Amino acid sequence: KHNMKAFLDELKAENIKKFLYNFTQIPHLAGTEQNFQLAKQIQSQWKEFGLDSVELAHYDVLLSYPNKTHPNYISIINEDGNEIFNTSLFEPPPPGYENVSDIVPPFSAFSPQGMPEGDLVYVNYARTEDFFKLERDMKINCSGKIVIARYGKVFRGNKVKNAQLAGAKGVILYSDPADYFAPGVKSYPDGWNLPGGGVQRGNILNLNGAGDPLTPGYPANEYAYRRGIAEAVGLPSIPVHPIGYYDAQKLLEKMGGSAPPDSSWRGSLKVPYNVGPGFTGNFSTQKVKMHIHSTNEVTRIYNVIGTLRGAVEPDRYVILGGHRDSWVFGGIDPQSGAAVVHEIVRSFGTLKKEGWRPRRTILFASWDAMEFGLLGSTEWAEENSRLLQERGVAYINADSSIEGNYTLRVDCTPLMYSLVHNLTKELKSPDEGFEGKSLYESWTKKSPSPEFSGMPRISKLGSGNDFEVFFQRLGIASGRARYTKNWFSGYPLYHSVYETYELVEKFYDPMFKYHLTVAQVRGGMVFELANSIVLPFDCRDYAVVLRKYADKIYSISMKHPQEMKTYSVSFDSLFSAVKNFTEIASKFSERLQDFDKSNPIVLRMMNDQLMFLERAFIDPLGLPDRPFYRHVIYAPSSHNKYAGESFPGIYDALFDIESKVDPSKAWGEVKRQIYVAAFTVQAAAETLSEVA
Amino acid sequence: KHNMKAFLDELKAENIKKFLYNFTQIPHLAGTEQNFQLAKQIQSQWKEFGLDSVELAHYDVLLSYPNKTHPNYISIINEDGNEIFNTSLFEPPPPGYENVSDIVPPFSAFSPQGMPEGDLVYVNYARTEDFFKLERDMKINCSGKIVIARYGKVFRGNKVKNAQLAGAKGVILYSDPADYFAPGVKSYPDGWNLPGGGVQRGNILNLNGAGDPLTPGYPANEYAYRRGIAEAVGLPSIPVHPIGYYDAQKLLEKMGGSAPPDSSWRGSLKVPYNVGPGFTGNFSTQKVKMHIHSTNEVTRIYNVIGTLRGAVEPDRYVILGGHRDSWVFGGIDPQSGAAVVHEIVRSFGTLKKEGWRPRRTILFASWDAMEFGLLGSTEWAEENSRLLQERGVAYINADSSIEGNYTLRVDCTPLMYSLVHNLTKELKSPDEGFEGKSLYESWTKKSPSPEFSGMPRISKLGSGNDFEVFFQRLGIASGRARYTKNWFSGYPLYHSVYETYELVEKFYDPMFKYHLTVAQVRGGMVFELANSIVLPFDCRDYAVVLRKYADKIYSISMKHPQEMKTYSVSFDSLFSAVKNFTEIASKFSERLQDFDKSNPIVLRMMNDQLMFLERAFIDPLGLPDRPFYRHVIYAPSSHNKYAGESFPGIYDALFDIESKVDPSKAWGEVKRQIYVAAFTVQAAAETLSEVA
């Protein structure tokens, strides 16, 4: 028959392997000819696989590239202005790729140009709390200094924002072996660790969901009216550049001034990790000089959009999307994901050629310019927002399929928890020691829920991937899944030249069994979402998490009992709303199970109630100063785009509140955010009441 | 049978008459006990009439009232500070009501307190062009002056905003007989004209759609967090008070300074209409002094919400709403409308008691605090916005049923033009000379379309009534209809104490036949919208008007050919989008007529495409500095809230552009607005394409 088992059985590890190899032989940098050619290949193949239509959707967006004839680098300069040490111009290419052209050298995308010269301050991970420690406790002033920060813990854009607000005149980012060199494993090509010449690329924007910096709100189409650079969204004001740990050792070894405040500031290099400012006595007249000459340029990008029309509800869309652009070869990021999408499309197309169609429409997307700020997905969603918010059932992301070989990692809306539990109980575990056991069993054993015995950990969605527009702007139920390691600082070869097909085939997944498991999870979710008669969402799971999040935010506020008394700060309305949501969801669930199953209008009313429940958490006014983060329950952390924050409006109103000069105003804003949250939870609850 | 004819035949003129009398014996001022009692009566009666549920929805909103022991008035003061002339403390009450208590004296709701003293400047209607003439041509400076303006032409809130920006320190509004005294008709009680002691009440806010000044975006519920007065939306900064023409004559007769610039500045009083500043020689040391002591106060209001659940699509709402609060007796405004709603509810309830239900759910609303800024409807819509934007089919307004006895007046979305033409062809004309002819025929004869022979005039929706939140904020197809006069300056007794039951019964509609015709139009529209299998919207009518509006806005821009050349200002994208909309709408219409009629999912997809088409013109970012005006095609005029403006974003970008100091910036913003409009029209068109 044509059921989920038939779909799942058609997926093959060997096909994923072939596609991965096919997608990783040359670089596919956004805006380059090679990535346009790959888009055309994928379009052709998806048509051959049997999709009903496959189109390219293009946009002209702001991208950033080094200058090929004026390379970026950092120096130590002596008192005469002689450059006595220079950082590398490129990563040593891996074996057999030493003649591959168009490898973009390491750079921080969207850095402005400049040649700032100054004294170094070491700022640990450049987190908000690292800057609090420097200014408030250590009394070190970063104003007019070049700061050097280790990658890790938080999104690099947040590091740069934090350095800017501290008054830094430039930022040097580096990979410390503490964070990117696993003990006991060899450097690439003999293992999966970062060599000392390896460097992590990546953008340093602070877009807060806007998409293309020049066209916030609207697609960057042929007639778009663009902001000037000075009014663009999210661009950094100071130069930034990334280096490897051989080069970092040379910049850090001479550092003087104050000692590190404790061991959480020390990485693994043989240097003191002194904070500065500047170098020790003998070298005190030497300085550090950056040379950044990259340019921002409006450049065409191409999304591939494939459609498999639904047989019964063609006006309901289930979306499987992931990006295609890579920094270099994209062996893990994104092609391990893209190869999985390709095999999922192939399997659905096999069923379609035998006469099957899903109940609802499935859309497949190969996004461009993700690496430059989620630009392809965001512009497309901006173009199609009306269609998406009235018809969008769900979005399943499909970036990297693997970041390790230990167990499953799932982040998603509470509406999908039951779907994920049920699906993983029907899938085979690929893990050694769990032969003949379910994926649910292996996952639950290796990654136990911190709340509930006998359940696996599922995390809330953060950001830094292409679901952002769909979930946090538009309120479409979203999820993601991949294979991960044991225990936000990525795998060692992340965004480096060393992330190749061979990395994956030799060290991560030689049999492609973890890739296949991830294909089954992502594809199985899509199948259920697109074919189940009743949408596979459980509103009661939202009720449970809303109480947890309400308890959490109340607990934060209750660190300030005197102020809560003075300003009459009550969470009673939020708990009331959460109680009401719990009650109404329970009653809706009863009707969903008991409704007349012959009546397709009651079913669709029910299905629309389910689809629009995630939508109900959207506030059209957005969060404060972040108009494109509209979901009231979930936003990316203001301190780390990768991490999700719950009740973000209240959280940010409470953050560091003891430091605000006007407590009356600050606690007034806490109360305002409690009102907005309680109202939104109640309003979402009421969408599940009987309709009339 | 149970069809529209049965519904229409049940409506009775004599019932409307009885309800009107019942609703107009005492004042029903928002926030007063008498208006709460009327709300409870209507709730009880709607339940008895047969609605499924009838609830009160209350909110606590900012209202404004005079101080009963510290009355508002204006003086002429001589050089010693003696008050030699005082304006009236109240309107002479009409016959038989001279002992009625709680008649609110004339005042401008939301005026701040103050006692400003100064020289008068007469500013005609206080329109934007009147202030342009004073400053730019006549070189008269209103800074620190008290301005005196005649009511008429534009919403009084716009007059006050314009006076404030001119630097006025107070505003006196008056009714000139040129605008409020029809030649040949007697003053009330012997005819329908305004007596010299009559005064027009009304609010002077500039809310731009916000609702309650203290809670923009969110309902003013029990736990709402309120702005402080200083941050409230829309409040005037200078005192304002309204007077009648006996009192105005006393203030105007001594005016000196400059002569009126032409005859369009002269009303009908026996005064010169000199502009000032100040009085002529003998009286030059005299001044005008206002005394305003009204207070703003958070006050409970009550909407009545009745539900008639749909038999087939109970999750689709057709709304019939109008306000209940009045300034005094509300003989026309609003009770002529409320009485019509009451009889419509009664007629639907009669059918329901015989076993009928409409296909879709009908909601009936008696709104409160309309007179204080559309507060009741707006707060309710804020509370229920998620339900409304996913389920709202249409909103039919029901304020005053009559403002004259000449012919029909209809303002509505283009989506309802065909519905209105078809319905009025099936209704009998009530007009003398058209016995046995259709309402369509009489209306078309008396109010010909300026574009098309053999069609009647239908206008675009402006604002100043309770449809605003539904149409311009939420994008729900809306309409209104009433009987009107031959040829924005209301009927003479508007918002005066003289607007009584007797006014209506003696002078406007003694047989209640015009009321009955309006009940048939409003009720018939609701019936069709709630019962037609395919929603009765024609998307092709939107295509026709979008071309008209595009031609209009292009024509405005083409008054500046040199600038369009310099800044490369093209409307090509907007015309392209309109062409595309026209083509796609034509194809959708073919499918709507040709689709398989047995398939309820294709029908609902079609019905959802129809319902969401008005929704597609909404921009979640709003218009510039007016976040609650979100419709890109239609907004209230920035110069006159009562008037609708098409392509408002482009219109306001072009307005007075020749006066802007930075033409590059100004024309850049024109181009931005063209892009937003072209994009929105294309996006709306694409919602009518095949869905997959």
Ligand SMILES: *[C@@H]1O[C@H](CO)[C@@H](O[C@@H]2O[C@H](CO)[C@@H](O[C@@H]3O[C@H](CO[C@H]4O[C@H](CO)[C@@H](O)[C@H](O)[C@@H]4O)[C@@H](O)[C@H](O[C@H]4O[C@H](CO)[C@@H](O)[C@H](O)[C@@H]4O)[C@@H]3O)[C@H](O)[C@H]2NC(C)=O)[C@H](O)[C@H]1NC(C)=O
């Ligand atoms: C969780 O869900 C529950 C419902 O089970 C909601 O309960 C409502 O809670 C509010 C309190 O926040 C109640 O509001 C009160 O309404 C009274 C009038 O209620 C009657 O009339 C209304 C219509 O006008 C009907 O809908 C209702 O059924 C009743 O018949 C007011 O008189 C109250 O105001 C008085 O007391 C307050 C507080 O002391 C004073 O501030 C006022 O000045 C005034 O003296 C009050 O407004 C409401 O009745 C409850 N509805 C119910 C039980 O159906 C919760 O609100 C909801 N949680 C959230 C966060 O929404």
Ligand SMILES: *[C@@H]1O[C@H](CO)[C@@H](O[C@@H]2O[C@H](CO)[C@@H](O[C@@H]3O[C@H](CO[C@H]4O[C@H](CO)[C@@H](O)[C@H](O)[C@@H]4O)[C@@H](O)[C@H](O[C@H]4O[C@H](CO)[C@@H](O)[C@H](O)[C@@H]4O)[C@@H]3O)[C@H](O)[C@H]2NC(C)=O)[C@H](O)[C@H]1NC(C)=O
């Ligand atoms: C009204 O509806 C029509 C459709 O009937 C829309 O037409 C589109 O118009 C735009 C122009 O604004 C066209 O854009 C052009 O696309 C070319 C590529 O098209 C092919 O590939 C795409 C996918 O990538 C397919 O969708 C398409 O079917 C074609 O196969 C580009 O090469 C063009 O760019 C080049 O020329 C321009 C202008 O000189 C330069 O600025 C560029 O730098 C570049 O050299 C251009 O982008 C689009 O193809 C049309 N689609 C069609 C016919 O299907 C109208 O846009 C629409 N009106 C509005 C307001 O939306």
Ligand SMILES: *[C@@H]1O[C@H](CO)[C@@H](O[C@@H]2O[C@H](CO)[C@@H](O[C@@H]3O[C@H](CO)[C@@H](O)[C@H](O[C@H]4O[C@H](CO)[C@@H](O)[C@H](O)[C@@H]4O)[C@@H]3O)[C@H](O)[C@H]2NC(C)=O)[C@H](O)[C@H]1NC(C)=O
């Ligand atoms: C994940 O899997 C779980 C476990 O299967 C699943 O929960 C189960 O869902 C079914 C179907 O809704 C539940 O069965 C219902 O239970 C009630 C009470 O026993 C019955 O009244 C229902 O009967 C009606 O519907 C039947 C068809 O479903 C008709 O045959 C019948 O005539 C009635 O109309 C029905 O049997 C079952 O109770 C739960 N089990 C739980 C919660 O433990 C869950 O839904 C899955 N999650 C997702 C997202 O799919």
Ligand SMILES: *[C@@H]1O[C@H](CO)[C@@H](O[C@@H]2O[C@H](CO)[C@@H](O[C@@H]3O[C@H](CO)[C@@H](O)[C@H](O[C@H]4O[C@H](CO)[C@@H](O)[C@H](O)[C@@H]4O)[C@@H]3O)[C@H](O)[C@H]2NC(C)=O)[C@H](O)[C@H]1NC(C)=O
């Ligand atoms: C206002 O009134 C006008 C005038 O009645 C009305 O326009 C008419 O609508 C009908 C119904 O859509 C149109 O009739 C259709 O015309 C085409 C071509 O002739 C036919 O193919 C259609 O046949 C299909 O549908 C029928 C049922 O409607 C089935 O019986 C049949 O098997 C087919 O499936 C159908 O007859 C008619 O052409 C227009 N007339 C015009 C435009 O002059 C208009 O819709 C009304 N407006 C509103 C808002 O209700």
Ligand SMILES: O=C(O)CC[C@H](NC(=O)N[C@@H](CCCC(=O)NCc1ccc(F)cc1)C(=O)O)C(=O)O
């Ligand atoms: O501009 C942006 O917003 C991000 C662009 C780019 N995005 C990424 O590289 N994202 C990777 C980096 C991983 C970061 C992370 O903290 N992931 C957490 C996570 C949790 C559960 C999963 F299933 C998958 C990932 C990713 O999402 O795979 C970047 O950070 O440079």
Ligand SMILES: O=C(O)CC[C@H](NC(=O)N[C@@H](CCCC(=O)NCc1ccc(F)cc1)C(=O)O)C(=O)O
């Ligand atoms: O605060 C506000 O936005 C308005 C409150 C109040 N609103 C009204 O009194 N509105 C009346 C005044 C009539 C103004 C007008 O220009 N009406 C035009 C019009 C056109 C077609 C119709 F079917 C009905 C009215 C009404 O809409 O009936 C007011 O102006 O003081």
Ligand SMILES: *[C@@H]1O[C@H](CO)[C@@H](O[C@@H]2O[C@H](CO)[C@@H](O)[C@H](O)[C@H]2NC(C)=O)[C@H](O)[C@H]1NC(C)=O
């Ligand atoms: C990746 O696979 C594609 C598809 O098999 C290859 O592209 C095809 O190459 C052959 C031989 O040059 C052509 O005849 C076909 O027209 C191509 N088909 C397409 C683009 O759909 C491509 O060569 C492979 N790339 C690598 C690096 O192996």
Ligand SMILES: *[C@@H]1O[C@H](CO)[C@@H](O[C@@H]2O[C@H](CO)[C@@H](O)[C@H](O)[C@H]2NC(C)=O)[C@H](O)[C@H]1NC(C)=O
């Ligand atoms: C990239 O760097 C090159 C080399 O410095 C820039 O090309 C030079 O530009 C200047 C004027 O801007 C000319 O006078 C030189 O003759 C050019 N040099 C060479 C070797 O061609 C180029 O402008 C930069 N590219 C950018 C900014 O995109």
Ligand SMILES: *[C@@H]1O[C@H](CO)[C@@H](O[C@@H]2O[C@H](CO)[C@@H](O)[C@H](O)[C@H]2NC(C)=O)[C@H](O)[C@H]1NC(C)=O
């Ligand atoms: C670091 O790189 C710089 C730039 O290439 C080198 O400095 C240049 O050296 C050449 C030849 O000696 C001079 O003609 C240039 O004027 C220098 N340019 C600048 C900007 O200083 C420098 O020698 C390199 N340092 C090391 C240690 O390799």
Ligand SMILES: *[C@@H]1O[C@H](CO)[C@@H](O[C@@H]2O[C@H](CO)[C@@H](O)[C@H](O)[C@H]2NC(C)=O)[C@H](O)[C@H]1NC(C)=O
């Ligand atoms: C308006 O009509 C209502 C309804 O007929 C009248 O209210 C009723 O009055 C009688 C006699 O006092 C009471 O017994 C009923 O309980 C009332 N019914 C309600 C409120 O539903 C009211 O008297 C009329 N008002 C005027 C001014 O005539």
Ligand SMILES: *[C@@H]1O[C@H](CO)[C@@H](O[C@@H]2O[C@H](CO)[C@@H](O)[C@H](O)[C@H]2NC(C)=O)[C@H](O)[C@H]1NC(C)=O
């Ligand atoms: C309305 O006006 C009255 C009368 O002027 C105000 O009442 C007076 O208030 C002052 C102090 O604010 C007292 O000292 C007087 O004795 C009061 N006079 C009387 C006659 O009671 C009243 O405050 C005003 N109401 C408002 C602002 O709502």
Ligand SMILES: *[C@@H]1O[C@H](CO)[C@@H](O[C@@H]2O[C@H](CO)[C@@H](O)[C@H](O)[C@H]2NC(C)=O)[C@H](O)[C@H]1NC(C)=O
């Ligand atoms: C206009 O009204 C004011 C206020 O009532 C009158 O002025 C008051 O007159 C009484 C009695 O003569 C004095 O005790 C008060 O001091 C006056 N108050 C003020 C504020 O001036 C005035 O007489 C009235 N003018 C006319 C022409 O009737």
Ligand SMILES: *[C@@H]1O[C@H](CO)[C@@H](O)[C@H](O)[C@H]1NC(C)=O
């Ligand atoms: C940091 O240094 C600059 C002066 O170079 C100064 O403007 C700023 O206020 C300093 N902050 C301190 C010392 O806290």
Ligand SMILES: *[C@@H]1O[C@H](CO)[C@@H](O)[C@H](O)[C@H]1NC(C)=O
């Ligand atoms: C694969 O799993 C083995 C066994 O647990 C482990 O030793 C190895 O480090 C893993 N490889 C990667 C790349 O994580």
Ligand SMILES: *[C@@H]1O[C@H](CO)[C@@H](O)[C@H](O)[C@H]1NC(C)=O
């Ligand atoms: C209007 O009058 C005031 C001075 O009383 C002044 O501030 C303002 O600039 C004047 N404008 C003119 C004369 O245009």
Ligand SMILES: *[C@@H]1O[C@H](CO)[C@@H](O)[C@H](O)[C@H]1NC(C)=O
């Ligand atoms: C009613 O109609 C008659 C006849 O046209 C007209 O003379 C009279 O002024 C109308 N009454 C009102 C209040 O408009």
